[PDB]
């Protein structure tokens, strides 16, 4: 798992905002990301923050971890980082402890989640679930990946319901499953014929392990 | 003590359902909040004209803060719908700027173009007039902007705590300072101490959007 | 929390409060997460 | 002559701003300072050993203990003769003013620096510091309630501000340029795994530097090596 | 039919929607997985990735209140 | 509670798989049982199982306790 | 509990089973309690 | 848990985190059990 | 709180104005303050007023 060729294993990461790189201005407490099927990418980033004697939050009140701007994260071994992240900051907390600490934590969401803020009414005659789907997310400014499905409808009704699940349903009812990362959205069908990538061996690289079975499904 | 509106109704029918309920869901759909104590129930608009109390500043008077802003709830503009046979035709209204408190340097209208939507919109398939429109779109915009920033504070025993009334919150920075809302209190004695915590800020959820207001078909037979 | 009715209620009067009110905040962030698309 | 133990007593983080200074009566006998390094221990199941990662390492300590002393057999150092210290409480109220009380204009402790001499920790010459921890015994009075003698034990942690730290951590790494000069025996390859840890660059860095032939260099080339890009 | 999930040390080439064979714990279990979600965590300096095995049996719309209610709520 | 002419007071139980008991070919840690009105019965079964250093799992790979059996 | 099925089920044999108890009462009541009007 | 989205996030760098976890799965288990006939 | 301040021989309002505040960028403000027509020749017997800041913003 570890990669060739790395002399010394120091892990080092990369926090860009608007481009501008951030890493060492700010004191970094902790880093989470989350990449999951059929759902939004989400990260968590929690810094340290606030002064009694002074009164005040110095990195709350500057200009770079205010919500709408645009957060690029990556990561690696021994300086050679690989891009993880890429979304905007939607939420912006302070918080003080009964001991004393104080930090800020700040919540940042990947560009699909401007598709599930509103209702909308839509009709569609004569065409495809994949032309439906890849025009409703080309009217937001994204990328399209959409394999093609077979059946030609009459008639297709949008009827009072946000964008994100009009896709879904649509999605899952033709068994095809979506993934949304870096400004492009990929509706196709899942990937079990390939060949696989690296072998977990219980007893050699695992550190947990969880496995279940249920036969009334 | 219910303080009286304007819009007067051909007919209002209060179906199957319990008198707590009925009374919260038109109570909403006009701006306006309930407050129960003391074998009294007042009905009237949220109270954020007023004069602050006191001053609540971190490193001098706090035991415990938090606070939080989300743009995903903020928007530019409500807009309602509905169909007029006597027209033949659609009827709309929209939203106005509520005024509200003033805190932090970032407006509601700021946070609005994160996600950057035109306007939200409400849509009724029967007879609503105009002046009902009008105030649906209104309260929607409401509860949009009083629930901007929420928070909660710990301090020791304060005997005048009082919901409903302005304080001003001081220390937390140019994003946070300034006159917040109060919407509950909680007073805890135990083995001798005696502490409250203050809640400031409304949620941005609708009351029907919470709880199961309506029976099941067939009347669960 | 954010919330007043979300806080834990103390019945005790003779003396570990600080871990009763961590295991909560990470179960209600753990479970209200789970309801957003 | 005999060189005294003295604390300075700063308003600003950047220790530029002095505001006094306090000097012993009588140097301590010994003192003691540690250190520490933390790692992560994680292991795989049925391994034997384990190879663990850096973390990051923690502030240094610092103990000390000193006495005062007011009965007259403890000469001062003025070169008067028949001088001897005579007063304990002055003493204490001067230094808890200097080290210990909040200051008005700054809501805090004061900053110390604390220096013997020519003594030397390390590299410098001072302890950069701040009080946490004190204790005083008062073992001996007068007929009228005024002590004398006092015994004070103190422990101090180590102080160092953001913009000088990341200063000091002078991080070199593939986010910076290099220049090295072509000796005898050298070859393009194994320059390049010595400055970037992987042969593989070698077909890029003969073309920022113009070479024709790769395979026979010249030996008082200056060859540049420039940083990577932020994310791949 | 199966689900799991496998906790390991810092993978910087995880992928989501890829195989990985999956062996040492029986018979009933060895194989080619399904990889679904990826989570990586830094606190401190310490590096660690969980991968996630298989998908959920239920529909998208049995889990998500996606209709509005009668009356438009009013 | 305890039933009278027990002479020792030590508590046992048996646990059979179709037909055939299996107590004692295995490491047994925790039974818990169920019987609720208006609910189906229920029981759950812990067992020591798993060596990192024959890299298997050998009560799993067996036939007395796999999905169906009685 | 007034329930049998909210009760937490014992795993372990070899020995604080009484704040694994504690901490699953305090969420129960804050959860069960958020559902009255 | 079988599922990434129900681990407990990680917010502190100096030093019971084998007691917030364990804390976790015993109420997920007694509410999702809470919910078949 | 409001201070108040001699000026003595060597002084200059931006290294006053850092002393005080501890950010020089207010210079402009206070020489509106006290009516100075020309704030980078100063008189060695002028007593400057130095507000308080606001308390939000």
Same mark, same amino acid.
């Given at each position: 798992?570890?990669?060739?060729?790395?002399?010394?294993?120091?892990?080092?990461?990369?926090?860009?905002?608007?481009?501008?790189?951030?890493? %060492?201005?700010?004191?970094?407490?902790?880093?989470?990301?989350?990449?999951?099927?059929?759902?939004?990418?989400?990260?968590?980033?929690?810094?340290?923050?606030?002064?009694?004697?002074?009164?005040?939050?110095?990195?709350?009140?500057?200009?770079?971890?205010?919500?709408?701007?645009?957060?690029?994260?990556?990561?690696?071994?021994?300086?050679?980082?690989?891009?993880?992240?890429?979304?905007?900051?939607?939420?912006?907390?302070?918080?003080?402890?009964?001991?004393?600490?104080?930090?800020?934590?700040?919540?940042?969401?990947?560009?699909?989640?401007?598709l599930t803020v509103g209702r909308h009414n839509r009709y569609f005659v004569d065409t495809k679930d994949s032309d439906a789907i890849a025009e409703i997310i080309a009217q937001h400014?994204?990328?399209a990946?959409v394999?093609?499905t077979q059946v030609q409808h009459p008639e297709i009704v949008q009827y009072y319901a946000t964008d994100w699940d009009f896709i879904l349903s649509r999605a899952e009812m033709n068994?095809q499953?979506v993934?949304?990362?870096?400004?492009?959205? *990929?509706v196709?069908?899942?990937?079990?014929?390939?060949?696989?990538?690296?072998?977990?061996?219980?007893?050699?690289?695992?550190? $947990?392990?969880?496995?279940?079975?249920?036969?009334?499904? | 003590?219910?303080?009286?509106?304007?819009?007067?109704?051909?007919?209002?029918?209060?179906?199957?359902?319990?008198?707590?309920?009925?009374?919260?869901?038109?109570?909403?759909?006009?701006?306006?909040?309930?407050?129960?104590?003391?074998? !009294?129930?007042?009905?009237?608009?949220?109270?954020?004209?007023?004069?602050?109390?006191?001053?609540?500043?971190?490193?001098? %008077?706090?035991?415990?803060?938090?606070?939080?802003?989300?743009?995903?709830?903020?928007?530019?503009?409500?807009?309602?719908t509905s169909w007029?046979?006597?027209?033949?035709?659609l009827?709309?209204?929209?939203?106005?700027?509520?005024?509200?408190?003033?805190?932090?340097?970032?407006?509601?209208?700021?946070?609005?173009?994160?996600?950057?939507?035109?306007?939200l919109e409400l849509r009724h398939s029967g007879?609503?007039?105009?002046?009902?429109?009008?105030?649906?779109?209104?309260?929607?915009?409401?509860?949009?902007?009083?629930?901007?920033?929420?928070?909660?504070?710990?301090?020791?025993?304060?005997?005048?705590?009082?919901?409903?009334?302005?304080?001003?919150?001081?220390?937390?920075?140019?994003?946070?300072?300034?006159?917040?809302?109060?919407?509950?209190?909680?007073?805890?004695?135990?083995?001798?101490?005696?502490?409250?915590?203050?809640?400031?800020?409304?949620?941005?959820?609708?009351?029907?959007?919470?709880?199961?207001?309506?029976?099941?078909?067939?009347?669960?037979? | 929390?954010?919330?007043?009715?979300?806080?834990?209620?103390?019945?005790?009067?003779?003396?570990?409060?600080?871990?009763?009110?961590?295991?909560?905040?990470?179960?209600?962030?753990?479970?209200?997460?789970?309801? $957003?698309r | 002559?005999?060189?005294?133990?003295?604390?300075?007593?700063?308003?600003?983080?950047?220790?530029?701003? *002095?505001?006094?200074?306090?000097?012993?009566?009588?140097?301590?006998?010994?003192?003691?300072?540690?250190?520490?390094?933390?790692?992560?221990?994680?292991?795989?199941?049925?391994?034997?050993?384990?190879?663990?990662?850096?973390?990051?390492?923690?502030?240094?300590?610092?103990?000390?203990?000193?006495?005062?002393?007011?009965?007259?057999?403890?000469?001062?150092?003025?070169?008067?003769?028949?001088?001897?210290?005579?007063?304990?409480?002055?003493?204490?109220?001067?230094?808890?003013?200097?080290?210990?009380?909040? %200051?008005?204009?700054?809501?805090?402790?004061?900053?110390?620096?604390?220096?013997?001499?020519?003594?030397?920790?390390?590299?410098?010459?001072?302890?950069?510091?701040?009080?946490?921890?004190?204790? /005083?015994?008062?073992?001996?009075?007068?007929?009228?309630?005024?002590?004398?003698?006092? *015994?004070?034990?103190?422990?101090?942690?180590?102080?160092?501000?953001?913009?000088?730290?990341?200063?000091? $951590?002078?991080?070199?790494?593939?986010?910076?340029?290099?220049?090295? !000069?072509? *000796?005898?025996?050298?070859?393009?390859?194994?320059?390049?795994?010595? /400055?970037?840890?992987?042969?593989?660059?070698?077909?890029?860095?003969?073309?920022?530097?113009?070479?024709?032939?790769?395979?026979?260099?010249?030996?008082?080339?200056?060859?540049?090596?420039?940083?990577?890009?932020?994310?791949?």
């Amino acid at each position: 798992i570890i990669p060739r060729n790395s002399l010394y294993d120091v892990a080092t990461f990369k926090l860009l905002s608007d481009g501008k790189d951030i890493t %060492n201005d700010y004191t970094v407490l902790s880093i989470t990301v989350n990449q999951i099927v059929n759902r939004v990418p989400t990260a968590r980033i929690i810094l340290r923050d606030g002064a009694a004697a002074d009164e005040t939050f110095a990195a709350s009140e500057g200009a770079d971890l205010v919500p709408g701007q645009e957060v690029e994260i990556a990561a690696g071994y021994d300086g050679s980082d690989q891009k993880i992240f890429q979304g905007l900051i939607v939420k912006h907390a302070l918080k003080v402890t009964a001991n004393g600490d104080s930090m800020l934590m700040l919540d940042c969401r990947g560009l699909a989640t401007k598709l599930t803020v509103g209702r909308h009414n839509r009709y569609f005659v004569d065409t495809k679930d994949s032309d439906a789907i890849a025009e409703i997310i080309a009217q937001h400014s994204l990328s399209a990946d959409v394999a093609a499905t077979q059946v030609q409808h009459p008639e297709i009704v949008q009827y009072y319901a946000t964008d994100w699940d009009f896709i879904l349903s649509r999605a899952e009812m033709n068994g095809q499953i979506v993934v949304a990362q870096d400004e492009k959205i *990929k509706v196709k069908a899942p990937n079990t014929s390939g060949a696989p990538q690296i072998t977990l061996t219980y007893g050699v690289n695992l550190l $947990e392990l969880e496995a279940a079975m249920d036969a009334r499904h | 003590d219910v303080a009286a509106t304007q819009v007067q109704h051909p007919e209002i029918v209060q179906y199957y359902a319990t008198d707590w309920d009925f009374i919260l869901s038109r109570a909403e759909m006009n701006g306006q909040i309930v407050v129960a104590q003391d074998e !009294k129930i007042k009905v009237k608009a949220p109270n954020t004209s007023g004069a602050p109390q006191i001053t609540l500043t971190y490193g001098v %008077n706090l035991l415990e803060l938090e606070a939080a802003m989300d743009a995903r709830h903020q928007y530019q503009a409500v807009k309602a719908t509905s169909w007029n046979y006597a027209d033949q035709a659609l009827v709309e209204a929209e939203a106005s700027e509520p005024t509200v408190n003033n805190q932090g340097n970032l407006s509601g209208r700021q946070l609005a173009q994160v996600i950057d939507l035109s306007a939200l919109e409400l849509r009724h398939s029967g007879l609503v007039a105009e002046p009902e429109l009008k105030a649906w779109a209104d309260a929607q915009l409401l509860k949009s902007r009083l629930a901007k920033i929420q928070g909660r504070v710990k301090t020791k025993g304060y005997p005048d705590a009082k919901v409903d009334v302005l304080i001003q919150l001081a220390g937390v920075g140019d994003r946070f300072n300034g006159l917040a809302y109060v919407s509950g209190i909680r007073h805890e004695i135990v083995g001798g101490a005696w502490d409250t915590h203050i809640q400031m800020g409304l949620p941005p959820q609708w009351f029907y959007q919470e709880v199961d207001i309506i029976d099941k078909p067939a009347a669960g037979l | 929390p954010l919330e007043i009715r979300e806080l834990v209620i103390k019945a005790s009067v003779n003396e570990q409060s600080a871990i009763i009110a961590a295991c909560v905040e990470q179960v209600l962030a753990i479970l209200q997460e789970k309801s $957003e698309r | 002559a005999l060189t005294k133990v003295k604390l300075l007593a700063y308003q600003d983080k950047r220790f530029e701003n *002095k505001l006094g200074e306090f000097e012993l009566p009588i140097n301590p006998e010994q003192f003691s300072q540690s250190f520490k390094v933390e790692y992560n221990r994680e292991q795989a199941q049925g391994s034997q050993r384990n190879d663990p990662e850096f973390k990051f390492t923690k502030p240094e300590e610092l103990k000390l203990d000193f006495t005062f002393d007011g009965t007259g057999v403890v000469p001062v150092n003025n070169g008067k003769p028949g001088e001897f210290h005579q007063d304990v409480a002055d003493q204490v109220r001067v230094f808890l003013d200097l080290v210990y009380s909040m %200051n008005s204009e700054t809501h805090k402790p004061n900053f110390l620096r604390l220096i013997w001499g020519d003594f030397s920790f390390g590299e410098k010459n001072g302890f950069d510091c701040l009080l946490t921890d004190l204790q /005083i015994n008062y073992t001996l009075f007068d007929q009228t309630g005024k002590p004398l003698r006092a *015994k004070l034990s103190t422990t101090f942690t180590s102080y160092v501000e953001q913009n000088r730290r990341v200063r000091e $951590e002078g991080k070199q790494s593939p986010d910076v340029t290099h220049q090295r !000069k072509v *000796k005898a025996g050298d070859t393009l390859p194994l320059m390049t795994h010595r /400055i970037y840890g992987d042969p593989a660059y070698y077909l890029q860095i003969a073309k920022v530097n113009g070479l024709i032939n790769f395979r026979k260099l010249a030996t008082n080339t200056d060859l540049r090596f420039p940083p990577l890009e932020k994310t791949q």
